[PDB]
RNA sequence: UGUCGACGGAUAGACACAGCCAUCAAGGACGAUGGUCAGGACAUCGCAGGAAGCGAUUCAUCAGGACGAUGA
């Protein structure tokens, strides 16, 4: 794990194809944009389990 | 862009190899954890630009 | 309708028997005291309309 | 004294002829709408104290 | 002169009209409540220098 | 009722004779210095009650 | 402003609704006029009743594969 601390409106990067943007907060909620090719998946942890258990949305 | 919201301490996933956790907020800052293999790089956008600047003789 | 602009610690008078005091202010909310006799009823609007919904007749 | 903590834009009632609305605050000033018949006299205490000196609104 | 040590949520007093309350700490920062009549002034040492040198009313 | 946020080593003032200094912190404990004239009293809230409620001289 | 939904690829959506302060007004009008965050407030927000009633609060810097460190 690599942990950072960034403000709202800032940006982060993964690999050479993936970008992340912290769009803002709403109380304890944190609104996060992800930007990746459809060659890779992105979901909430509660959702990720469905695409990995029975692959409910392949694409 | 795929936007997801998370409450503090909740999690997100990317691909089949990467996990993300929003650890918490402090003011307008957000402590964010990134868990990926060293097979991929991770950087904030202000550092990412250096990996796009070109580099030699790694660690 | 008669509009007035009353500052913290000042008072309005109604009829010959009712008086109103702005005891103070707390941002977007206001702390108002009513000085009417128990011969007349005083209630919030969301508590006046519950009275006048019909519940005053005997069992 | 009957006391209420009222937000701006909420309302209050007295007897069966009078209604009050807290139109808003302007700093430590408080804009109040008073909605009684002209059958009742309705002024700030400053004014009321002359009217009860033995008169009505002067020439 | 009086030196004393008090923990968060405890109280201290001056004269017959002044109260001090430690609301709590944040690292080296210490949030303090001060309760005195408008008969007396209160500011931090930075601002106090005005009340000594330039005052709140000219000649 | 004023509220301030002072850090260790800094000062606050009351009236035109009284000075307060935050001497430092130890966990929850907060060490404080008070400088007032002989014309006034100063104690912690525990001891203050002896000067308010029971007094240091009888009738 | 907080909360929720949303396998959604959208700088997205849904639900419940978020600045501060002075001057004039016997005025019946949701009146008029001007300024603007180290203050006189536990900064705002919630509950309720004939009582001048009641409960509860942080921000920022550095930075690497570490649920990172630190300052105010």
Keyword list:
homohexamer, 59 residues, alpha+beta, 3-stranded antiparallel β-sheet, 1 helix, 5 strands, 15% helix, RNA-binding
Main sheet characteristics of chain A:
3 strands, antiparallel
Question: How many β strands of chain A by DSSP?
Answer: 5
Tell me the β content of chain A.
Answer: over 45%
How much is the radius of gyration of chain A in Å? 13 Å
Count of alpha and pi helical runs of chain A? 1
Shape of chain A: globular
Q: Which structural class do you get from the secondary structure elements of chain A? A: alpha+beta
Number of domains of chain A: 1
Measured between the Cα atoms of the first and last residue of chain A, the distance is: 27 Å
**Hey, which two chains have the biggest interface?**
E-F, 40 and 41 residues
What string gives the helices and strands of chain A in order? Answer: EEEEEH
Short characterization:
Chains A, B, C, D, E, F: InterPro entries: CsrA (IPR003751), CsrA_sf (IPR036107). 6 copies of one chain form a homohexamer. Chain A has 1 helix and 5 strands.
Structure description:
- Chains A, B, C, D, E, F: Homodimer; the beta-strands of each monomer intercalate to form a hydrophobic core, while the alpha-helices form wings that extend away from the core.
- Chains A, B, C, D, E, F: One of its GO terms (cellular component) is cytosol.
- The structure is a homohexamer of 59-residue chains.
- Chain A starts with a strand and ends in a 6-residue tail after the last helix.
- The longest helix of chain A has 9 residues.
- Chain A has one domain.
- In chain A, β3 and β4 form a beta hairpin.
- With 59 residues, the first copy, chain A, is α+β, with helices and mostly antiparallel strands.
- In chain A, strands 2-3-4 form a three-stranded antiparallel sheet, with no helix packed on it.
- Chains C and D meet through β1, β2, β3, β4 and β5 of C and β1, β2, β3, β4 and β5 of D.
- β4 of chain A pairs antiparallel with β1 of chain B.
- Chain D binds one RNA strand of 72 nucleotides through β1, β3, β4, β5 and α1.
């Amino acid at each position: 794990m690599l942990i950072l601390t960034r403000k709202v409106g800032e940006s982060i990067n993964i690999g050479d194809d993936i970008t992340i943007t912290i769009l803002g907060v709403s109380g304890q909620q944190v609104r996060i944009g992800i930007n990746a090719p459809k060659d890779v998946a992105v979901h909430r942890e509660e959702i990720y389990q469905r695409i990995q258990a029975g692959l409910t949305a392949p694409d």
